[PDB]
């Protein structure tokens with residue numbers, strides 16, 4: 173198994189209310205876990221636990237290897253669009269091109285005279301919310317890792333663009349990779365190997381889309 177949580181309870185503040193309560197799941201290598209739930213349910217906190225920023229007060233956690241994290245808040249640093257996506261990782265033309273195509277950034281980049289050398293984050297170009305989200309997603313996906321933590325990465329995208337990139341990037345380009353995707357969208361839960369729905373820290377549902385349909 174690649175990631176396990178067993179009876180996990182955790183607190184951000186000593187003596188506060190638990191942010192996660194008796195959470196259970198397992199992800200095998202190469203699978204996709206969808207993590208859903210309302211605002212404040214604990215989804216980002218669950219990712220933080222996997223990244224070692226929050227320790228369990230009860231329960232056990234298993235995860236090994238290197239992590240790539242995509243924040244739900246998209247961000248850009250001063251530099252070219254290519255530099256923002258590679259972000260200090262060694263460069264490979266084929267890998268880079270595959271990521272930007274899977275994130276629909278080829279269209280955006282082709283429109284600039286400077287192409288992949290267009291400069292971001294320095295007062296020239298002002299990116300849309302959807303461009304910044306796809307660049308942030310591409311940055312996380314370009315990075316080689318054992319586990320990809322994609323926290324609501326489709327911000328500002330219309331539902332068809334979100335669907336297309338979920339399929340081209342999360343399902344096809346990343347098909348061999350262990351993935352945790354924070355998302356509420358029905359198709360994403362249906363395509364996931366497992367679903368975890370959080371509500372106020374607790375496991376509202378854990379299982380498969382098919383199991384939920386049978387209920």
Ligand SMILES: Cc1cn([C@@H]2O[C@H](COP(=O)(O)OP(=O)(O)OP(=O)(O)O)[C@@H](O)[C@H]2O)c(=O)[nH]c1=O
Nearest residue numbers: 184191209210211212213214215216217218220244
């Ligand atoms: C990430 C984080 C969260 N919290 C608290 O934990 C609860 C759950 O918050 P969440 O996990 O961010 O909820 P979410 O499911 O990701 O919500 P959303 O991103 O709005 O969909 C909230 O009390 C937050 O204050 C902290 O105190 N410190 C933190 O660093």
Ligand SMILES: [Mg+2]
Nearest residue numbers: 215216217244
């Ligand atoms: Mg969050």
